[PDB]
Amino acid sequence: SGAIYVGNYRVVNRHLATHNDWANLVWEDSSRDLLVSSTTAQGCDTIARCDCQTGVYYCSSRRKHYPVSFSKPSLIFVEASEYYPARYQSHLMLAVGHSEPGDCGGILRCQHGVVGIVSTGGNGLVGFADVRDLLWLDE
Ligand SMILES: NC(=O)[C@H]1CCC(=O)N(c2ccccc2)C1
Ligand SMILES: [Zn+2]
């Protein structure tokens, strides 16, 4: 689990979105596993605006943060789960690391701010849904 809180927005994994997230929907993209809902309280997370390929992510199944090198956002084949059939997920970044289903929502951060959230895993890889291209989150 986990979310990003920036301005009047909440960013979550689309497959973990709640009834309240869907009742206050701003934007969702199934191909990216992202959903953004509106909030009444102001969030103070900072989104990174950069092309970093190194950062640190939180892994709840280890209660640890790990430093990782990750690929640039791209279209990557993702195995089927209970939430989606096997498909290409877009705007996904991969790194070598640990990720279980419950790790989704953990934040990946660089020196500039939040880069994305854990969205995929298995086979010793961890995949993060990028949020750096969503410039509107800042206004
Ligand atoms: N983005 C996705 O398609 C998610 C769907 C649900 C799910 O549990 N995914 C997953 C995450 C970590 C390890 C193993 C699988 C992938
Ligand atoms: Zn950066």
Asked if 74 and 59 sit in the same domain, the reply is yes
Q: Is 105 helix (H, G, I), strand (E, B) or coil?
A: coil
- Catalytic residue, chosen from 21, 33, 103, 130, is 33
List binding-site positions.
50, 52, 110, 112
> Known catalytic residue: 91?
no
Residues 58 and 118 in one domain: yes
Q: Indicate whether 24 and 50 sit together in one domain.
A: no
Active site residue 51: no
Pair 38, 73 in one domain: no
Distance between CA atoms of residues 11 and 38, nearest Å:
9
Q: What is the C-alpha separation between 73 and 130, in angstroms, rounded? A: 6
> Nearest residue CA, atom 13 of ligand 1?
121
Spatial contact of 32 and 129, defined as CB atoms under 8 Å apart: yes
Resolution at which this structure was determined, Å: 1.4
Same-domain pairing of 34 and 54:
no
d(Cα 129, Cα 120) in Å, to the nearest integer?
A: 8
* Domain stop point among 12, 29, 44: 44
Domain that holds residue 117: 45-139
If one counts the domains in the chain, the total is 2
112 C-alpha to center of ligand 2: Å?
4
Q: Are residues 40 and 81 in the same domain?
A: no
Q: Which of 59, 91, 104, 130 is catalytic?
A: 104
Task: Kindly provide the residue ranges of all beta strands, DSSP E only, lying in the chain, ordered along the sequence.
Answer: 4-13, 25-29, 34-44, 54-59, 64-69, 74-78, 87-96, 107-110, 113-122, 125-130
How many Å apart are CA 92 and CA 107, to the nearest integer?
14
Cα torsion 89, 91, 96, 101 to 10°: value is -50
